[PDB]
Paper text:
In both cases, the chAbs bound to the SARS-CoV-2 S protein in a 3:3 stoichiometry, indicated by the three distinct EM densities protruding from the three RBDs, which were all in the open conformation. Focused refinement of the cryo-EM maps by masking the Fab and RBD to yield a better definition of the binding interface, thus enabling de novo model building of the Fabs and the S protein to define the atomic details of the epitopes of individual RBD-chAbs. In the case of RBD-chAb-45, the phenyl ring of the key residue F486 on the RBD was encaged by the side chains of Y94L, N52H, D57H, and T59H of RBD-chAb-45, adjacent to a bipartite hydrogen bond between Y489 of the RBD and N52H, and N55H of RBD-chAb-45 in close proximity to F486 of the RBD. Additionally, T478 of the RBD was hydrogen-bonded to Y91L and N92L of RBD-chAb-45. The overall binding interfaces between the RBD and the light and heavy chains RBD-chAb-45 were 190 Å2 and 362 Å2, respectively. Additionally, F486 of the RBD is sandwiched by a T-shaped edge-to-face π-π interaction with Y94L and a CH-π interaction with T59H of RBD-chAb-45. This unique binding motif may help stabilize the complex formation despite its relatively small binding interface compared to that of RBD-chAb-25. Fortunately, RBD-chAb-45 and -51, which share almost the same epitope, retained high binding ability for all three major variants of concern. Although mutations of N501 could perturb the binding of RBD-chAb-25 to the RBD of SARS-CoV-2, none of the reported mutations within the RBD overlaps with the epitope of RBD-chAb-45. In particular, the epitope of RBD-chAb-45 is less utilized by other reported nAbs, making it an ideal candidate for use in antibody cocktail therapies.
Numbering used by the authors:
A (entry chain A): 330 to 444, 447 to 530
B (entry chain L): 1 to 110
C (entry chain H): 1 to 120
Write the structure that this text describes.
Amino acid sequence: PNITNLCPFGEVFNATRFASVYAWNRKRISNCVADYSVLYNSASFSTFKCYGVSPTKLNDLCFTNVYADSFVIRGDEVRQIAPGQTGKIADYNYKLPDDFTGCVIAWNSNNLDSKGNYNYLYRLFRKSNLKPFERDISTEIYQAGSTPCNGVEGFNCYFPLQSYGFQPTNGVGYQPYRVVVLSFELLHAPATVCGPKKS
Amino acid sequence: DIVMTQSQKFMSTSVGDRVSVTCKSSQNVGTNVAWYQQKPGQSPKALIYSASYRYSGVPDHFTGSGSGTDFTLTISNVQSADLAEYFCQQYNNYPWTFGGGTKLEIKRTV
Amino acid sequence: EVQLQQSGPELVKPGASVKISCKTSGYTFTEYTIYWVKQSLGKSLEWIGGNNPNNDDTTYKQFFKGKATLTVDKSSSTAYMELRSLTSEDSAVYYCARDGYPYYYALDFWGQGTSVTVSS
């Protein structure tokens, strides 16, 4: 059949505004048919590290209830996004479990944040590492001293959120990168989203 | 404001009697203290933590007190290695300031 | 596995500048702050101040002006005190301590101290 029911899977990749890295954006896509091959075919995708399956087998296999996690990171932090690795962002902002059969895309957005951008916040201080797929949203004055922390901020009383120095005259490591992570569960019971078929 | 006197500067116990020292503080600022032993010549050794807790590295046979704006500590007895200086702690505001200290003297008789 | 090796006694001159080193080794230096106190020959203990190895923060007491300066270095993994205006009564012993945030608050570990004496 024609089966022309393309879903917003092809729209989130072209969204002008994303969310913060600690308040990473989550999208659930299902009940649609879209081609996954057109993504890596384009030459505008700088980084494509896809662990769950080979890039050419996305269309061959059918999945369920696909989940997309989107955020923005710095230029020299792309290696932090990997299952079972170290990193300040990988520990206090977003962590991948080792048993993660997912797929990762990342691309530059330097021209979209030129002057630069000073509305980005990221966690820097936390008691322990984050749990997998944890939407930890909260605000508190981080304390690192024996004396109790109360009232106004000061010594051993810090704000765990800081901005980004995304100046328009910076090279690699200071250019914003849009990062999206695709995950899915295989055939829990029904099947809604599969690869396209040609006739 | 900031003052610590613990109602005494030095106390004397001869033999057998239990030793106890208070750590009376200023007006209500919080509840967090500590007590350190100061042997005559080397670094201070912590005696009690928050006036009621235990140390893994000390043979702890100690009695503490409750909570509030007043503090008290009770030590086991007057052994042969108790003659030292007693220091109390108060850590609520950044300008830390302690008391004048307490001295334990073994009152030898005739 | 916590240890602290300091310098020996020093003789200073009034109206001069001297240095004191607190060396920390055998454990990570980044997390816990370092505190400085003094003992003036058995008198009451004064909290000289404290410093943060990571944020490079420095905090003093209410009345400390005259030698208000701290520094630390990670290459040598130590801290340096600078003493100035050694006028008439600063002859005392300096003690360098480290606290613990996960456990054992309030200056668990101490040092041997450095005795500085003022003379002509």
